[PDB]
Design a binder for these strands. Sequence first.
RNA 1: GCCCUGAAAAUGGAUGGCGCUCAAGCGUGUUACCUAUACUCUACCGUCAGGGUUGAUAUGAUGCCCUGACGAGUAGGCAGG
Length: 52
Amino acid sequence: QVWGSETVASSKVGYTLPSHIISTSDVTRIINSSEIQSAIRPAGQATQKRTH
RNA sequence: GCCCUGAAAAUGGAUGGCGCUCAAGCGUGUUACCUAUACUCUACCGUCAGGGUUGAUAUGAUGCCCUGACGAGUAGGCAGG
Ligand SMILES: [Mg+2]
Ligand SMILES: [Mg+2]
Ligand SMILES: [Mg+2]
């Protein structure tokens, strides 16, 4: 009642809860999604060999 | 050309000094040699630039790592402590 919900308006006059700018906070799961993984090229070594 | 005369100033006095006369002087030529915080190569510190790497089960993605170049400073500006 005090802060409102998706189906209940907050008792505060004209107030609504802040909106998220990102759907989820786990970016690793987003990267591991099939859509992203099927569009990227294979990675490297994480520590480049010294050639000279 | 060199040397000499012309050429007289006040404390004692300065090719830097000693000293030097086929010079250790003057003109010229040929080599060797000495040494700057400059140049070449290497290491380390920092700065800037271009790149690699989120995959869980081990910790900093402002993380870790690869490559190249650069570094004087009053007045003054900015940044990290
Ligand atoms: Mg001579
Ligand atoms: Mg030097
Ligand atoms: Mg400086």
